[PDB]
Amino acid sequence: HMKIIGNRIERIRSEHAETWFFDENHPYRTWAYHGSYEAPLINGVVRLLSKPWDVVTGVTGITTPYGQQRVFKEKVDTRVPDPQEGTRQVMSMVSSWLWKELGKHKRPRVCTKEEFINKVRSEAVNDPRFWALVDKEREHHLRGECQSCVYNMWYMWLGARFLEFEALGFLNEDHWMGRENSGGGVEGLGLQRLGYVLEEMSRIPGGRMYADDTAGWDTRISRFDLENEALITNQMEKGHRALALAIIKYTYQNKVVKVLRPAEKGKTVMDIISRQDQRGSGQVVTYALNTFTNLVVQLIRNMEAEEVLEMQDLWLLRRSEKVTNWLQSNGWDRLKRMAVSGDDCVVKPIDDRFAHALRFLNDMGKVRKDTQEWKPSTGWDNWEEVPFCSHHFNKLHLKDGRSIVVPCRHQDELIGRARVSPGAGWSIRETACLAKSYAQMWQLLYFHRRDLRLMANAICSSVPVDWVPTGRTTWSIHGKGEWMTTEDMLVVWNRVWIEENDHMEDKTPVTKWTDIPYLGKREDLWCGSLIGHRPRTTWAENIKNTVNMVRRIIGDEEKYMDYLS
Numbered sequence: 159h160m161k162i163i164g165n166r167i168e169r170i171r172s173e174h175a176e177t178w179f180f181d182e183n184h185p186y187r188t189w190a191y192h193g194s195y196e197a198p199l200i201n202g203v204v205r206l207l208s209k210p211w212d213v214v215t216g217v218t219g220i221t222t223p224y225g226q227q228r229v230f231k232e233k234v235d236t237r238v239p240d241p242q243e244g245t246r247q248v249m250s251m252v253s254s255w256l257w258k259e260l261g262k263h264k265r266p267r268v269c270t271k272e273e274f275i276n277k278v279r280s281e282a283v284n285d286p287r288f289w290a291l292v293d294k295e296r297e298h299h300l301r302g303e304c305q306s307c308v309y310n311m312w313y314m315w316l317g318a319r320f321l322e323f324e325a326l327g328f329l330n331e332d333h334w335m336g337r338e339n340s341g342g343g344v345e346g347l348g349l350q351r352l353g354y355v356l357e358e359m360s361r362i363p364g365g366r367m368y369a370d371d372t373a374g375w376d377t378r379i380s381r382f383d384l385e386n387e388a389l390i391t392n393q394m395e396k397g398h399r400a401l402a403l404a405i406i407k408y409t410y411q412n413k414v415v416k417v418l419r420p421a422e423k424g425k426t427v428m429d430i431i432s433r434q435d436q437r438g439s440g441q442v443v444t445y446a447l448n449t450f451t452n453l454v455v456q457l458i459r460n461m462e463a464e465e466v467l468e469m470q471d472l473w474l475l476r477r478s479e480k481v482t483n484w485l486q487s488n489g490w491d492r493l494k495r496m497a498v499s500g501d502d503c504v505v506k507p508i509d510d511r512f513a514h515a516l517r518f519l520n521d522m523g524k525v526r527k528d529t530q531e532w533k534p535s536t537g538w539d540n541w542e543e544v545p546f547c548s549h550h551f552n553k554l555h556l557k558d559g560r561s562i563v564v565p566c567r568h569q570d571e572l573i574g575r576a577r578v579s580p581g582a583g584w585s586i587r588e589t590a591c592l593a594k595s596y597a598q599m600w601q602l603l604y605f606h607r608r609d610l611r612l613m614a615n616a617i618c619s620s621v622p623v624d625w626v627p628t629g630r631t632t633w634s635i636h637g638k639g640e641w642m643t644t645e646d647m648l649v650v651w652n653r654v655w656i657e658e659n660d661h662m663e664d665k666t667p668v669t670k671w672t673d674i675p676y677l678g679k680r681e682d683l684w685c686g687s688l689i690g691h692r693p694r695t696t697w698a699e700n701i702k703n704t705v706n707m708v709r710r711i712i713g714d715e716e717k718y719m720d721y722l723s
């Protein structure tokens with residue numbers, strides 16, 4: 159490990175030699191500590207148009223070394239015992255099988271510089287020097303060394319991210335975890351489709367639907383998980399394999415991290431730590447690898463439930479042919495009984511033995527959130543109540559009687575995130591264009607929420623019609639950004655929910671917003687609506703005044719549209 163992280167530690171120790179020191183009283187328990195050195199937000203438009211939520215802490219409650227240290231000590235400075243050898247044998251077998259299924263109709267490839275550039279443009283990438291540094295680190299990797307692939311507690315230098323993209327980006331670009339290729343994956347599906355996936359699963363004969371969340375998934379990715387994820391390199395030709403093995407072994411299996419920590423009299427230090435497991439969040443293929451390993455975990459849980467695996471198999475896997483047979487016979491059926499998106503999963507097992515199939519799950523360190531370790535899981539009878547990707551999904555009916563299945567979540571989080579501006583010296587223009595992005599996203603996905611349809615229409619009425627939406631409104635890969643457009647949102651709504659919606663049999667267009675339904679009031683309120691409560695009523699009654707205010711701020715000379723009418 160030390161020989162692997164060596165030149166990175168040296169490269170930092172020398173960039174910072176005059177302030178470099180070793181803190182004997184550092185707080186790191188499960189990370190290797192190597193030394194330290196000395197170290198150095200509201201969207202106004204949305205806020206002006208969402209006054210009732212100024213006093214809603216669920217909304218308003220949404221950098222400092224003092225915080226990073228706290229979250230590090232409680233979340234990341236932890237360790238889990240190794241799984242037993244039999245458990246590890248099962249993990250390796252299932253991983254090998256799954257990789258071979260995923261690669262049956264797809265071949266790994268190197269992703270290109272121009273792919274990365276084009277993906278970025280949707281100008282460090284248009285400096286030759288950047289690519290000189292990149293080529294440089296690359297030849298280091300090809301020689302068997304790493305100088306500069308270091309995490310900031312988990313952001314990374316754009317060059318390192320390009321090398322990762324080059325070696326493993328194919329998993330994303332060629333949709334290895336798409337539902338067609340993986341059975342249980344959902345990569346490429348939007349929030350406008352996931353609900354249909356859950357409904358489909360609800361129809362499969364079997365037990366309840368289970369959606370257990372793992373407590374701190376990324377922190378419970380083991381070195382064995384990483385080794386099993388690395389098995390994809392066996393499907394690569396040798397050069398590609400060299401690049402990928404470099405990325406995995408020097409960046410995944412042996413990571414170096416810089417993290418901030420408070421010092422004396424307002425001063426700040428940077429600590430350099432390292433370890434050999436856990437997932438570095440926010441890497442290029444973090445999502446794909448999380449999806450992979452979660453699929454493996456659920457397959458194993460099903461095998462325990464169905465009594466293919468027994469207690470004795472934890473210590474040492476006796477006859478492994480039973481595992482191979484179960485995978486070849488039932489593997490794909492079980493995969494199609496899953497919806498897995500990174501660390502999130504829903505499973506429809508063949509019966510409810512799944513609920514108490516916990517031995518391998520717990521031995522793998524994948525302990526369930528908010529539950530006693532050996533308390534059986536509780537599943538759902540009603541697919542519309544199942545949590546998945548921070549949402550639940552409801553069937554609603556258009557005025558003409560056709561049904562749609564829509565994404566829903568507690569409203570406070572949506573409004574709270576829309577109020578956040580990532581910039582600083584952000585003009586009214588960038589602020590307004592971001593507000594417009596949120597509004598149009600709500601029009602596409604959360605139109606069925608009264609407060610959000612109203613607020614979105616006010617925002618869209620307060621921003622010049624020709625201003626193009628900018629910024630990002632979600633980190634979920636299932637928010638596909640169809641709303642990032644100046645195209646009319648009813649047209650976009652039709653394309654998303656009718657035209658290109660395979661679960662919409664009748665392709666008759668919807669020609670007005672009033673034909674598009676809300677949740678029932680009970681449901682709207684349950685999920686955080688303020689309909690009926692006085693500040694919200696006042697807000698709605700005054701909304702045109704407020705819109706005119708924002709218009710006067712941005713400029714009365716601009717062209718505005720009335721989406722409130």
Ligand SMILES: [Zn+2]
Nearest residue numbers: 304305306307
């Ligand atoms: Zn490197």
Ligand SMILES: [Zn+2]
Nearest residue numbers: 566567568685
């Ligand atoms: Zn809801």
